[PDB]
Amino acid sequence: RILTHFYQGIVQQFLVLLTTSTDESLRFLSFRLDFNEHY
Amino acid sequence: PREIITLQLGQCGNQIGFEFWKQLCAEHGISPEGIVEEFATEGTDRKDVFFYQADDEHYIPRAVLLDLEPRVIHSILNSPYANLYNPENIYLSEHGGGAGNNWASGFSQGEKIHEDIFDIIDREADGSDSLEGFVLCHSIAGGTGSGLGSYLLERLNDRYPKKLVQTYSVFPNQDEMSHVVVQPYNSLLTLKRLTQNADCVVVLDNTALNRIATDRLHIQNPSFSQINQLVSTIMSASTTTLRYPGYMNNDLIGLIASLIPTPRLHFLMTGYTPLTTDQSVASVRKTTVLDVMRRLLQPKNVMVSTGRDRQTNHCYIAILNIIQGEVDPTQVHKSLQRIRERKLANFIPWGPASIQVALSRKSPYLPSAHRVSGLMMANHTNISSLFERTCRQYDKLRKREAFLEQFRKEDIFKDNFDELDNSREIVQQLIDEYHA
Amino acid sequence: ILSTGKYLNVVRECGHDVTCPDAKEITYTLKEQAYVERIEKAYNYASKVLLDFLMEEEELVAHLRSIKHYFLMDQGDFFVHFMDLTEEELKKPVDDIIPTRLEALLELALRMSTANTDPFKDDLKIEL
């Protein structure tokens, strides 16, 4: 359970930096990651 | 996001909501069984605010329809608009009810089907993680819509406390008292629940319907097939900021927040002028916005039976004037310029008033993108005349020994009649006190 | 001469085949207002092909529509959702990964309440 809590904090830290868009088709990359975790 | 669940209930509440959903497909450019037009996304920029969000571009209605009478639902499935409705969200085939005509019937039937009535209507609640609220599209006439509708105004107040409640309720007819005689009893029992167990209402009088139904509509025998035409347009007119893309008060908690002065003062007067099809041949010459709101404050389009000589000591506090479609917005501030010169609205002497005007583009359709439409949501303090009309018909009936022995056999042991009388007079006294 | 001169450099940047003449060669009468006739002949074709170019393809009307929707703030269905999400993240001092999560909420709501067209509204970059 501590490792699942470590895992979910990494994937939250993933999607934050993936929404930190520098915009050279980075809007395309931020589109794909919220689609995976929610759908 | 902004998903609202409509609670269609009763013999009259199911029919006024049936053509309300039927009105929405003609303006969204969609069919109830398919998508044949591409006008749904390029013309309309928002569709998932009253419908359920799509799984196959099939916008399911977020609607529930319960009634004791099976006659209102058997006139639905043969119509080709019932395939848009789902036979698993509310009921499957052969749904029934009571016998049945009583206010105490549906008031006692709410806690015996308590497990099933809070099971399938809550499945649509968690579809969106930010629920707007609940609108009880119910009736006051009869014992079907008034008996069961008073129960859900109590148990949804604490189970869903952070949600907006506001209803488009229709008032019954007070012409003669032969077919129904239980009309003063079931109306005032629901009217108490509409003020303290409910935030806002939208009143819709029945004696004011045939005032308009013979005004320009030219009928000789008044039928029930005309009651759905005045009601379904102003329902879709009230959500034009909410369905179509608007900016300010584009939510249902936006419009109602800017009009209610205080709790137990929420009865809003409604007005809607354009209902005639032969006006279409002369709207080609740029009919402007400068003449459409001069007749809204003039008591001609009102749907509330009120006194004509009682408006001098009463004062408007909040008045809404909604223009739709083609507005020509370079003269919409010009229309609001002419309001202060006439002073057709009496203003409250203790505080400021407000004439709020808003606009939104209508459907990409030829009767909609050509003719000007004006929706009024007034709030005037002459609404106690209806409350004086209902109370004078209430205490006169209790002195005639009418329905005091025929009404207290089931689930009524104490006299709750003056519990409704004082709370109604509390509304009538705080209205006149509100202008100091 | 320079306003038509800086003009011709842009049309060369569009393409080499697209030039502005419309061939008004041998010119320059000895007499006095020779200049201004050749000024308007170049300036009125500068009126021509740029009504042809930018309104048709480079879409200054369609850019300025979406320019007027997110600073002058029309299209208030998508907009009020993202201002609620921006308010939730700006009620505290920001951390390092917080601006990246702010940028993830921008294009999320674009396909929630749809705009006029969604891959054209990707010109919005977030700053503080």
Curated annotation (Swiss-Prot), chain A:
Cellular location(s): Cytoplasm, Cytoskeleton, Microtubule organizing center, Centrosome
Similarity comment: family membership: Belongs to the TUBGCP family.
Function statement: Necessary for the recruitment of gamma-tubulin to the centrosome and for the formation of a functional centrosome.
Record text on subunit structure and interactions: Interacts with gamma-tubulin.
The protein, known as: Gamma-tubulin complex component 3 homolog
Organism the protein comes from: Xenopus laevis (African clawed frog)
Included range, full protein: 847 to 885 of 906
Swiss-Prot record, chain B:
GO CC annotation terms, alphabetical: centrosome; cytoplasm; gamma-tubulin complex; gamma-tubulin ring complex; mitotic spindle microtubule; nucleus; polar microtubule; spindle
Compartment list: Cytoplasm, Cytoskeleton, Microtubule organizing center, Centrosome; Cytoplasm, Cytoskeleton, Spindle
Molecular-function GO term, any one: GTP binding
InterPro entries associated with the record: Gamma_tubulin, Tub_FtsZ_C, Tubulin, Tubulin/FtsZ-like_C, Tubulin/FtsZ_2-layer-sand-dom, Tubulin/FtsZ_GTPase_sf, Tubulin_C, Tubulin_CS
Keyword list, A-Z: Cytoplasm, Cytoskeleton, GTP-binding, Microtubule, Nucleotide-binding
Pfam family, one: Tubulin_C
Record function comment: Tubulin is the major constituent of microtubules. The gamma chain is found at microtubule organizing centers (MTOC) such as the spindle poles or the centrosome, suggesting that it is involved in the minus-end nucleation of microtubule assembly.
Protein name per UniProt: Tubulin gamma-1 chain
